[PDB]
Amino acid sequence: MEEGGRDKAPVQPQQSPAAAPGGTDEKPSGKERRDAGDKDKEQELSEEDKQLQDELEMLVERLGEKDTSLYRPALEELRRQIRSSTTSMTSVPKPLKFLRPHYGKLKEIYENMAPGENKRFAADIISVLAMTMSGERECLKYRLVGSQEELASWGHEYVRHLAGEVAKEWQELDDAEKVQREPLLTLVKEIVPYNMAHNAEHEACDLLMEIEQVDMLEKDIDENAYAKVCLYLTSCVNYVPEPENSALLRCALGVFRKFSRFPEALRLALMLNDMELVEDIFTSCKDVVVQKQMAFMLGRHGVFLELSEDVEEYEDLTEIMSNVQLNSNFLALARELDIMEPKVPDDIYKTHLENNRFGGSGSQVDSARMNLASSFVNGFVNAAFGQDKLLTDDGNKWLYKNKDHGMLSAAASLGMILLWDVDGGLTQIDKYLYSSEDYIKSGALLACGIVNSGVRNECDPALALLSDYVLHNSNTMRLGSIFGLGLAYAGSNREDVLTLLLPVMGDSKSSMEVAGVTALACGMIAVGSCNGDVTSTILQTIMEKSETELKDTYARWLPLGLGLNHLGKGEAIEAILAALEVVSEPFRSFANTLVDVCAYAGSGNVLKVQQLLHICSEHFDSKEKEEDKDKKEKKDKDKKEAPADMGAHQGVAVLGIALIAMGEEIGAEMALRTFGHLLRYGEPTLRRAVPLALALISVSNPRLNILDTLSKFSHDADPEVSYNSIFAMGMVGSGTNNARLAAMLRQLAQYHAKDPNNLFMVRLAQGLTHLGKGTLTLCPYHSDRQLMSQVAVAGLLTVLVSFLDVRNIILGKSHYVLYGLVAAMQPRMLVTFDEELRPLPVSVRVGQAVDVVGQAGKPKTITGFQTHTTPVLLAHGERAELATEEFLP
Amino acid sequence: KTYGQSTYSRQIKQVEDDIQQLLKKINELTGIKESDTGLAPPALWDLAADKQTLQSEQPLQVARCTKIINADSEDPKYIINVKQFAKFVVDLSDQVAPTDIEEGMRVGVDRNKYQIHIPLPPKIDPTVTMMQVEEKPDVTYSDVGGCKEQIEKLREVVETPLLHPERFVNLGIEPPKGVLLFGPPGTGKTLCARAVANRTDACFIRVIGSELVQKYVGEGARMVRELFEMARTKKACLIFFDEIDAIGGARFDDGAGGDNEVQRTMLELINQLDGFDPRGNIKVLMATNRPDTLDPALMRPGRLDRKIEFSLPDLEGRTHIFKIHARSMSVERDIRFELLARLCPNSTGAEIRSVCTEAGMFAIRARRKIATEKDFLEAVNKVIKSYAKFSAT
Amino acid sequence: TPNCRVALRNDSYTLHKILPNKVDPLVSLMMVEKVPDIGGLDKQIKEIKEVIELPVKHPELFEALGIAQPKGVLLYGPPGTGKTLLARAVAHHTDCTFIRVSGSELVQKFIGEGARMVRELFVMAREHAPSIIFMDEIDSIGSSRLEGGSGGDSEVQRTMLELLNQLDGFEATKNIKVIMATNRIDILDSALLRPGRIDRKIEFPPPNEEARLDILKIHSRKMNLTRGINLRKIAELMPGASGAEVKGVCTEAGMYALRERRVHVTQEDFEMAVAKVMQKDSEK
Amino acid sequence: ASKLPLVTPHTQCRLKLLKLERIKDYLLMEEEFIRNQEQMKPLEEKQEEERSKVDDLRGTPMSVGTLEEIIDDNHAIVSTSVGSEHYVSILSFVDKDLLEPGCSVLLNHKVHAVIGVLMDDTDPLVTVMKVEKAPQETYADIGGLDNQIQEIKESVELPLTHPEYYEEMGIKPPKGVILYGPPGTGKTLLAKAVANQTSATFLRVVGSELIQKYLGDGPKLVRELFRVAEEHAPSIVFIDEIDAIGTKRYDSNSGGEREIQRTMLELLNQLDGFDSRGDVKVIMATNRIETLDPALIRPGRIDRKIEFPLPDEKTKKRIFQIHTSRMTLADDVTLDDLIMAKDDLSGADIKAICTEAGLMALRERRMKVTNEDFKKSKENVLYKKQE
Ligand SMILES: Nc1ncnc2c1ncn2[C@@H]1O[C@H](COP(=O)(O)OP(=O)(O)OP(=O)(O)O)[C@@H](O)[C@H]1O
Ligand SMILES: Nc1ncnc2c1ncn2[C@@H]1O[C@H](COP(=O)(O)OP(=O)(O)O)[C@@H](O)[C@H]1O
Ligand SMILES: [Mg+2]
């Protein structure tokens, strides 16, 4: 404790500052020159961030409280001369002379008045005098004033200029780290009116720095991972023009302004498609911006590139629609055949070879329904790229043997065989078509739409499945003919043929299991804020289901075609439109929870989550709205995959404690679809916790629910070491978990991961985290999986080709115009970085290094090295163009 | 007392904290059985405690492990010891194929009838299991700038034949499997080791030079046996030694009662390195600070082929290392380092990082966000004078 | 209680009855507290009077100057040399309950009770009365430092670590001291025990004529002797004689009384015993 | 327990407020939904049903075994107390996370299956080497050090206490610290002082104890030392007296000296060779400083070399005042008689003085203090240095 003798600051600034009645009066040099000399001594000595207890900042205030208390809070004759060296050293050490209630009266000391500007003497500062003061303003005072009456006198005018200097001031001491701290000021300042702050912050950033656009930019998107309902709406459209005005990246326009297409209104990114047609700069970044526009997050954008520029800068359109899709063909065309793919691996039905030597002899498993899974040994494995000439003779005999829905099934696996095909997919179907069969014809033809899906080249706009539908007096001629064209034309929202199949629902002909999948199929073309098909459906709903609703074939298929396409929207109006037309009773009100959160896919609304559990938790009303709470928990399944890790940990904490530990029918029947929709890559946490409720099937229930969860627990990153789990559960499931209902199921899930050994992308995630269909096609399976004989008759149409919106797998590709390059890549882990510093490592697993077609994987954000020039997009996406250049290598 | 550094300073802090504690209070409120002397929490073994543990009970017996000696003619007729129990003439169970039961094998056999059930992985002790790195630190080749000749020479040896076993066949040559590194300390050898191990694409094996000296005779050699065994097993694996001076530096015999055991061990490394049926696909990287007092047997080529050294940067290696250790840190846009390196005529990359991190300590003590450029000026000044009147120098 | 026998089943190994211990081995080998009642040893007596008799009678002095009263003591000299019994008496001079600790090697191997042989000993010291404890070369012979460290711990240096575990407490001696006398003083961990724990050592100079005379009576004390003898002449017949050796002198004289065919320990016996004992002392 | 990994803002960003408010509302929702379980159907079929069922499934006579190897998922190889090694499968009941080789286990009688695991003991090494508690006086015991205290503080204390400067720039702190100067300076004082006022573990090490009659353990002691210090907790390692054990290769001889060269070698590579230790504080004490190995001297290993000067008449008046604070003092004495006379006397010498008073006055059993007590005491220490 070395004090006393050297407390000059605690003496001269403790005497002259003390006697203002003696200093301000009767001593002009005493009030003026000693206070000014205490303003350069305190501004230069007690005014910078240096420690807790400065020579003055803590020491001149210990008795400097009353010392400051009467030097100039009370003279009542203040002039335009005694405001520079009078509020001169009393004003700076204010925040620690007073106490925590300084936020209400934080305007009398340094918010009172500075001599000219905050930087006139707060340029030699970090945050003590003026910076943290200004933050203390915009925290509380500008909010309470800016709630209702902003423009009063001085809490807005001086604030207007102060915000411009504080904004660049976060980058001013050093344009480096608290750059992102500035959005703590622009966001906390006028939370709702963020565009009022980002309106000046946008151009101030436009003049801020060319190199300083991307990190505070990614901090804007950082604060746009989720915000207040009016802030995710606002700061996202704020987020767009930064790479448009100051920076010029503009290849994250098409996909990362799909960030800002739907959350604002209907037409914003169609005017941003016009933005594409206005930003007609060099065609490599243009070409790859438009690459995603067909089969990477959306399609049907091929009626806007046929203007006068149709030479190459508008001839990129059809290249996107089917030609670059044809390079998706060549992907396995010349890459997977060369690397790792013969047409028929056939090692799933053969990898189950050693099991016969455990327990003695075999040949006891002779269940015919297992042959249903026998079709998927060919169906899944050829799922996109691969054919079979008499390699399908098992479906040749079993197709001509029994199991009519097995004829539809085996006929349906052919489209999975020839997927992403336009050349001969119909030529394959034609031979196996002329057999006088409804399941075979309606299955292969329905598979044809699977074949031309995302193509948009002429395959059958009205040729194949329209002619299939025009003979529909009956079975899956009437039933499955409408499914394949909606599947094929889901990515391309053509309204005409959907109007052709609107009379499918408007017919009112007996469509027991045909009408629900009708609204599902035409909904595949265009449902979701469905203007016409929601109409034609729930007209027939108020006609028939108003008077009969027993099974989920009626009730469980219509509301899906109320609000299931536009699950990327968040406006919540179509819940009002479609919902209010069916506001009758509880059973017809099972749809009430459908479109409510079907406009709530992923975002920040934990208050919507508490209204997602607290209303209907258990309630035990003796089996009346148990399905209502089952579906309400079903809507707990979304808003957990893309709140960006926010909903995941709390969903695993909640589900791991409530349902499986102490739960009800809701948990013992359906509670695993949260994992059948939540994760798609697989990790040891759920990968072990699920079989803790899976190996123990709890068959007292309709055990094919835990067996249903068996299937979609194989939903993880394609191949894994989980063959131990699935294989062992197939051995214990040989006798137990009878093959009469599970023999197709166990190998069904066994083979799903290992189908073409790649190609699982329906996660509603692209690039790093945005959205993209993945729900119209995936979801109807998990909704179609309740428990029982919907795996028997009605199910075989959906269960086979329910979800087919998988967009390949990987990104290792060159596409330099000749397409010969093999540029040195370097596989790693997903980029975990948001903000730590400037020299911050993008990934960690730098060990692996590849050059050509490889493995994307779920958590991977590979960049590469050597600067062979990745100028096309620099934001990934698996068909980079590689504009080559020697940028000082 | 304090101030509000960012607007709602405690307003997020205690709000986070009390719900964090409420996470606990949920758990103790619901009732959690903790500290049951080494078990699992009941939430996940309640639905695993069923007969799907008897599936591990009855289908899998005790399976006592034993060791194989030899076989016989026309039939297995296997001769096996248990470990210390007794030696028997036993036979395999029908669950196995009479192919992968070769001699010197650890195999699981029934306790009742003494029939072989399972082939096992051979034995490998923890003392060497722990020196296998099993991980690759993130050390990029760019971080080792300033030794362009050295990294090239090493690249020609440990990298090019492996990743491109084509040129050496098209010309008909053999790569020099034996590399030694040396030079003054604090220079870029370790860094080179970690970086090569980064892109190692191989079973890289650390070796600490003093780990071999032991209390009993020959046991250290017994280490070396397991070393070259795991090497020959793991195809295309790398070995690193470090300060091998402890091993076999000389053959002091004027008064032959000094060091002999690690001399014998060094001889074992001699034989199991080269001589009598060479190893095949293995690469050896060494490094020492005094490569002057070593037994010339290691100095013979074939074993220690290349002698790469790391020197002291004249003026420009220190510049580039200013670009290496000064890059991964926060500074103003007013950089310049030639002025710096012209001020430090003799300093290593390690001292370069010392000046870069010492740069931050001023703003760190002076309550600043980042190391401003001028603050870095102050840093190099205090390290110019500090290194000028340094304690040892 | 830990370290106790129990009746066990053979089928389920269920406890039947907690069988009683034999005897607490330290409690059956409980060190003697006999009645604490030396030509050659008088100068060091003062040194132990100041290293013991001072802080005991004078808490308030080293409290007044605030200095740790010396409790740990060390002496050094030829073998035995009254190191034992001088401590035995200094423990009594202030009524401070001598606590012998032979513990030479018989307690060093005892692994089970080696974690308590110090504990309940010191509890004895603080329970009986003001009590002085004495140590000797035993620890110096058993373990010194980490030499027998990582390679087995030797079961002894650890118990020493419990010793320092207790000395690193709060006593200020109060009136209690602990003496120690050992050869091989350059091996132990006295570096740690210097500050506060233990303190100086005092030397042994050789004995003298009247010294070995009074020794001669005190060690011819439990015998059957004769008058008509200048015993002073006898102690004067051994110029270069140590202490304990005088005890063997008395034993030799008793031997000569044995060969004299009588129980009278006469002057013949000592006059020859000086010659024989010294004759055995004739090698260097 | 690992409820949310994100700490990326490192500020009061509204991002973080949204994060912790969301996580808050989620936790409240879980606590309430589970709260409505004991409301509609408060039941207790999950405490002694599963516990009792498995307590009876597993066995009594809980034979203690030893882990040998880990294979796949459920079967591992174990070793009985005598050597009988069994290829036994484990249950999903023991913590699979705390299951590593060289660990005691619980086994069955018939199948000998792994039932449970026994928690490990506290190794004797920590008890031997670690100064268990705050041993000695706090910062009221300094005679004088301010730049020393600054260097060691911002090198260790300021980093751990306020780790909000190093992660602003991403700059890591200096690693090694050499405390050197003339003997009797107070190196032990400052080491035991920071050990007193500290929050992480502390270790004290002597160098003379690194010589075995067994051959070549040495670096065994080193490696196990740093192993325990690292594995244990945030570790503050302190090694005093490395000067008489690690100086340099003076003649490159053999026979014990070569052994010490190997040992300090292992303290070098083990000091910092590979995969940087992390949370491994290292502090080294030396008397001399020139006869040290510069390979250890270079950066990476030690970044702060602190000199220990000897004050002359300014802090000595507080050193005599501290060593005379807890003692009587007659009015016949004046500390300036001896403080105002010499200008290099070590604090160890002031200690021998203020203790020599306690020897002199109470050897004679006189009253509190006399000036000749400090006279004869100071002269006595004068012969303590001079002789
Ligand atoms: N050219 C350089 N570039 C970057 N860092 C360097 C350079 N030279 C030295 N260093 C730094 O100095 C330290 C010493 O380097 P290195 O460990 O390779 O020397 P060494 O020879 O292994 O040390 P020793 O000889 O003491 O075993 C390294 O940790 C490294 O970060
Ligand atoms: N400034 C001081 N104030 C108080 N005591 C001191 C001072 N300087 C030295 N000493 C005493 O001198 C002794 C020397 O300590 P230290 O330098 O650690 O020993 P060594 O030099 O043998 O390592 C300390 O134990 C302390 O009691
Ligand atoms: Mg090295």
| Degrees, nearest 5: CA angle D62-D71-D113 | 20
- Side chain identity, residue D288: R
Residue type, A274: D
B119 is in an annotated binding site: no
> Are D171 and B371 a contacting pair at CB < 8 A?
yes
State how far Cα A758 lies from the chain centre: 21
Q: What is the CA radius of gyration of chain A?
A: 33
Integer Cα distance of A659 and B246 in angstroms: 62
Structure tokens at A175: 């344009």
Instruction: Using DSSP, state whether A772 is helix, strand or coil.
Output: coil
To test the contact with chain A by mutation, choose from D18, D24, D27, D32 the residue with the greatest count of A C-beta atoms within 10 A, namely: D18
Interatomic CA distance for residues B208 and D269, integer angstroms: 8
Indicate the helix (H) or strand (E) that contains C64.
Answer: helix C59-64
| A476, amino acid identity | T
Is residue B135 within 8 Å of residue B149, measured between CB atoms? Answer: no
Give B182's strand partners: B309
State in Å, rounded, how far the first CA of chain D is from the last one.
Answer: 65
Question: Has D216 been labeled as part of a binding site?
Answer: no
CA distance D7 to D22: 15
- State the Cα–Cα distance between residues C257 and C263, nearest whole angstrom: 6
The SS3 of residue B220 is: helix
Q: How far is CA A797 from CA A472, A474, A744, A753, D315, in A?
A: 16, 15, 15, 21, 93
Look at the block and give the residue holding tokens 């790093």: A768
- The verdict on whether residue D170 carries a ligand-binding annotation is no
Quote the radius of gyration of chain B (alpha carbons, Å).
Answer: 30
Hey, is the C-beta of B47 within 8 angstroms of any chain A C-beta?
yes
How many CA atoms, within 13 angstroms, populate the side-chain half-sphere of residue B386?
Answer: 16
**What burial letters (b/e) apply to D31-44, b meaning 16+ CB within 10 Å?**
bebbbebeeeeeee
Q: How far is A685 from chain B (nearest CA, A)?
A: 11
Which residue in chain C is spatially nearest to D365 when comparing CA positions? C61
CA B14 to chain centre: 43
- Between CA B324 and CA A246 the distance in angstroms is 30
The secondary structure element, H or E, covering residue A749 is helix A739-753
CB-based contact, A181 to chain B, within 8 Å: yes
Question: Which of helix, strand or coil describes residue D259?
Answer: helix
B183 is in an annotated binding site: yes
What lies within 8 Å, CB to CB, of D82 at 6+ separation is none
Tokens of A785: 């999986």
Backbone angles phi, psi at A681, to 5 degrees: -105, -40
Is the torsion defined by CA of B156, B159, B160, B166 positive or negative?
Answer: positive
- Give the 3-state secondary structure of residue D67: strand
Beta strand B178-182 with B282-287: parallel, antiparallel or unpaired? parallel
**Best interface-test mutation with C: which of D58, D362, D366 has the largest number of C CBs within 10 A?**
D362
| Matching residue, tokens 């920040």 | A604
What proportions of chain C, in percent to the nearest 5, are helix, strand and coil? 40, 5, 55
CB-based touch B/D (3+ pairs, under 8 A): yes
Using CA atoms of B100, B101, B102, B105 in order, give the dihedral in degrees to the nearest 10: 120
- Enumerate residues 151 to 190 of chain D having a beta carbon within 8 A of any beta carbon in chain C: none
Tell me B50's DSSP state.
Answer: S
Q: Which helix (H) or strand (E) holds D117?
A: strand D114-117
Centre of ligand 3 from the C-alpha of residue D129, in Å: 28
- Whose structure tokens read 């409505």? D36
Distance from CA of D384 to the nearest CA of B (A): 29
Nearest to A846 by CA among B147, B159, B201, B188: B201
Please state, as a whole number, how many other Cβ atoms lie within 10 Å of the Cβ of residue D27.
Answer: 20
Would you tell me how many other CB atoms lie within 10 Å of the CB of residue B253? 10
Nearest to A877 by CA among A819, A826, A807: A807
User: In whole angstroms, what is the distance from residue B289 CA to residue B303 CA?
Assistant: 19
- Evaluate: CB of D184 within 6 angstroms of ligand 2: yes
**How would you classify residue B68: left for phi > 0, otherwise alpha for psi between -120 and 50, otherwise beta?**
beta
Q: Binding residue per annotation — D247?
A: no
Q: Say if CB B221 and CB B265 are below 8 A apart.
A: yes
Cα A725 from Cα A734, distance rounded (Å): 14
- Distance in angstroms (rounded) separating the CA atoms of residues D346 and A639: 71
Phi, psi for residue D46 in degrees, rounded to 5: -140, 25
Who contacts A274 (Cβ-Cβ below 8 Å, separation ≥6)?
A: A304
Residue B242 CA to its chain's centroid (Å):
12
- Greatest extent of chain A over all pairs of C-alpha atoms, in Å: 117
Please report which helix (H) or strand (E) contains residue D87, including its range. Answer: strand D85-89
Structure-derived torsion over alpha carbons of residues D318, D323, D327, D331, reported in degrees to the nearest 10? -40
Kindly determine whether residue C191 and residue D206, on different chains, have CB atoms separated by under 8 Å.
Answer: yes
Write the DSSP assignment of A323-355 as a string of letters: IHHHHHHHHHHTTHHHHT--S----HHHHTTGG
Ligand 2 midpoint to CA D155 (Å): 22
DSSP state of D74: S
The token duo for A852 is 């050509």
Q: What is the arrangement of strands in the sheet containing D201-205, beginning at the earlier edge strand?
A: D201-205, D235-239, D280-285, D177-180, D304-307
Residues 6+ away with beta carbon under 8 Å from B55: A732
**Does the beta carbon of A699 lie under 8 angstroms from any beta carbon of chain B?**
no
In order, the DSSP letters of C68-133 are ----EEEE--SSSTTHHHHHHHHHHHTT---B----SSTTTS--SSTTTTTHHHHHHHHHHSS--E
Strand partners, D89: D75
Q: How many angstroms separate the CA of residue D337 from the nearest CA in chain B?
A: 35
CA dist., res. A324 & res. A456, Å (int): 12
Is the Cβ of A621 closer than 8 Å to some Cβ of chain D? Answer: no
Secondary structure, 3-state, A403-435: CHHHHHHHHHHHHHHCCCCCCCHHHHHHHCCCC
Indicate the Cα dihedral angle A515, A517, A518, A519, nearest 10°: 100
Say if CB D334 and CB D371 are below 8 A apart: yes
Region of A519 please: left (phi>0), alpha (psi -120 to 50) or beta.
Answer: alpha
Q: Looking at residue A792, what DSSP letter applies?
A: T
End-to-end Cα distance, chain B: 45
What are residue A430's phi and psi, to 5 degrees?
-65, -40
Q: Residue D235 in 3-state DSSP?
A: strand
D167 close to A (CB below 8 A): yes
Name the residue among A155, A154, A151 with its Cα closest to residue A138: A155
Distances (CA, A) of D39 to A660, D33, D36: 18, 10, 5
Give the HSE-up count for residue A407: Cα atoms under 13 Å, Cβ half-sphere.
Answer: 19
The backbone torsions φ and ψ at residue D78, rounded to the nearest 5 degrees and listed phi first, read -120, 170
| DSSP letter string, D134-154 | --S--GGG-SS-SHHHHHHII
Atom of ligand 2 nearest to the CA of C195: 25
Beta partners for residue C135, in sequence order: C180
Give the Å distances, CA to CA, from A530 to A301, A303, B49, B183: 19, 21, 50, 75
* Beta carbons of A594 and A559 less than 8 angstroms apart: yes
Contact between A777 and A490 under an 8 Å Cβ cutoff? The reply is: yes
- Reference A392, options A432, A365, A420; nearest CA is A432
Strands C72-75 and C178-181 come out as: parallel
Long-range contacts of A659-663 (CB under 8 A, 24+ apart): A660/A692, A660/A693, A660/B47, A661/B43, A661/D46, A662/D34, A662/D37, A662/D43, A662/D46, A663/D37
Of A607, A835, A837, the CB nearest to D169: A837
| Ligand 3 center–CA D272 separation, angstroms | 8
Give yes or no for a contact between A670 and A634, defined as CB atoms under 8 angstroms apart: yes
**Residues D321, D335 contacting (CB under 8 angstroms):** yes
**Which residue in the set A181, A649, A662 is minimally distant from D37, CB to CB?**
A662
Ligand 1 pocket mutation, candidates B138, B154, B187, criterion most atoms within 8 A of CB = B187
Q: Is D78 helix (H, G, I), strand (E, B) or coil?
A: strand
**DSSP secondary structure string for all residues of B228-297:** HHHHHHSSSEEEE---THHHHS----TTS-S--HHHHHHHHHHHHHSSSS--SSEEEEEE-S-TTSS-HH
Rounded distance between C-alpha atoms, residue A855 and residue A21, angstroms: 80
Distance D273 CA to ligand 3 centre (A): 6
The C-alpha angle with vertex B169 and arms to B165 and B173, in degrees rounded to 5, equals 100
User: Do C151 and D217 lie within an 8 Å CB cutoff?
Assistant: yes
Note residues around ion ligand 3 (Cβ under 5 angstroms): B 190
Query: With contact defined as beta carbons under 8 Å apart, do A115 and A84 qualify?
Result: yes
Are D300 and B350 in contact (CB < 8 Å)? yes
Please classify residue A556 by burial: count the beta carbons closer than 10 Å to its beta carbon, then call 0-12 exposed, 13-18 middle and 19+ buried: buried
- Of the candidates A568, A564, A489, the one whose C-alpha atom is nearest the C-alpha of residue A528 is A564
| Pocket probe mutation, ligand 1, options D298, D301, D302, D303, max atoms within 8 Å of Cβ | D298
Experimental resolution (Å): 4.1
D104 beta partners? D66
A728 vs D: CB within 8 A = no
Helix (H) or strand (E) holding D75: strand D75-79
How far is Cα A633 from Cα A785, in angstroms, rounded to an integer? Answer: 15
* A59 neighbors A9 (Cβ within 8 angstroms): yes
Nearest C-alpha neighbor of B40 from the set D57, D92, D76: D92
Q: Do the beta carbons of residue B352 and residue D168 sit within 8 Å?
A: no
Q: What is the CA radius of gyration of chain C?
A: 23
Question: Measured between alpha carbons, how far is C210 from C233 in angstroms, rounded to an integer?
Answer: 10
Do A646 and D36 make contact, defined as CB atoms within 8 angstroms? no
Q: Is D189 in the pocket of ligand 2 (CB under 6 A)?
A: yes
Strand D280-285 to strand D177-180: parallel, antiparallel, or no bridges (unpaired)?
parallel
DSSP H or E stretch at residue A65: helix A64-69
Q: Per-residue DSSP letters for A109-175?
A: SSSS--SS-SHHHHSS-SSTTTHHHHHHIIIIIHHHHHSS---SSSTTHHHHHHHHHHHHHHTTS-T
D184 annotated among ligand-binding-site residues: yes
Is residue A572 exposed (0-12), middle (13-18) or buried (19+ Cβ within 10 Å)? middle
Residue nearest to atom 25 of ligand 1 (CA): B185
Sheet holding C178-181, edge to edge: C133-135, C178-181, C72-75, C198-202
CB B108, CB B101: distance < 8 Å: no
The maximal CA–CA distance of chain C, rounded, in angstroms, is 80
DSSP H helices in chain D: 14-35, 37-40, 48-57, 124-129, 147-152, 158-161, 166-169, 187-196, 219-232, 257-272, 294-297, 316-323, 336-339, 347-363, 371-386
B95/A357 touch (CB, cutoff 8 Å), yes or no? yes
Taking a C-beta distance cutoff of 8 angstroms, is the pair A559, A549 a contact? no
B87: distance to nearest CA of chain D, Å?
A: 14
The three state secondary structure string of C8-55 is CCCCCCCCCCCCCCCCCHHHHCCCCCCCCCCCCCCHHHHHHHHHCHHH
Ligand nearest to the CA of B191: 1
What residues of chain B lie within 8 A of the CB of A833, using their CB? none
Q: Which among A30, A355, A432, D223 is positioned nearest to B95, based on CA atoms?
A: A355
Task: Give me Rg for the CA atoms of chain D.
Answer: 30
Choose the closest CB to D23 out of B19, B193, B328: B19
Cβ–Cβ gap D34/A662 under 8 Å = yes
How much distance in Å is there from the Cα of A55 to the middle of ligand 1?
Answer: 43
In this complex, the chains that touch C, judged by 3 or more CB pairs closer than 8 A, are D
DSSP B133-200: --S-----GGGGTT-HHHHHHHIIIIIHHHH-TTHHHHHT-----EEEEESSSSSSHHHHHHHHHHT-
- Decide if D358 and C67 are in contact by the 8 Å CB cutoff: yes
DSSP string, A666-688: HHHHTTTTTHHHH-SS--HHHHH
Q: Please state, as a whole number, how many other Cβ atoms lie within 10 Å of the Cβ of residue A281.
A: 11
Q: Which residues of B touch A656 (CB under 8 A)?
A: 43
Please check whether residue A799 is in contact with residue A483, taking contact to mean a CB–CB distance below 8 angstroms.
Answer: no
The answer to whether D214 contacts C151, with C-beta atoms less than 8 Å apart, is: yes
Q: Does D84 reach chain C within 8 Å, measured CB to CB?
A: no
C13 has a chain D CB within 8 A of its CB: yes
Residues from chain B contacting residue A661 (CB–CB below 8 Å): 43
D20 in contact with A at a CB cutoff of 8 Å? no
In degrees, rounded to 5, the angle at the alpha carbon of residue C131 between the alpha carbons of residues C125 and C136 is: 85
Q: What is the largest distance, in Å, between two alpha-carbon atoms of chain B?
A: 91
